[PDB]
Amino acid sequence: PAICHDGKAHFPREGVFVSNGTHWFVTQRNFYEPQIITTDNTFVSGNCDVVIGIVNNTVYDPLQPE
């Protein structure tokens, strides 16, 4: 249902979190177009202490490379 990166949560802006055997992706509801989890696809709100079933994972950042 969510991802806890740094003591926070990351809910999908529009779509669902889907994982194959190893890696994670965010995709549309009615099609299969996987994308890499970036800070644009997610909005942060919470503390990842009350969410049930959260996973740790990691979220990339587009600002740091440039």
Binding site: F11, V16, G46, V50, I52
Partner: protein, 49 residues
Amino acid sequence: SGWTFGAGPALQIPFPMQMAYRFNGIGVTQNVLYENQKLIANQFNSAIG
């Protein structure tokens, strides 16, 4: 399966995710549900009782 079984083949989905999607359809962000889940479940049980 939510509402998908009325259009095409039935597709599985966990119930809390379905309620999150239903909240997302009346202009309320989904993070409301996942932060207040036990209270909502208790309210639903009391209402159905």
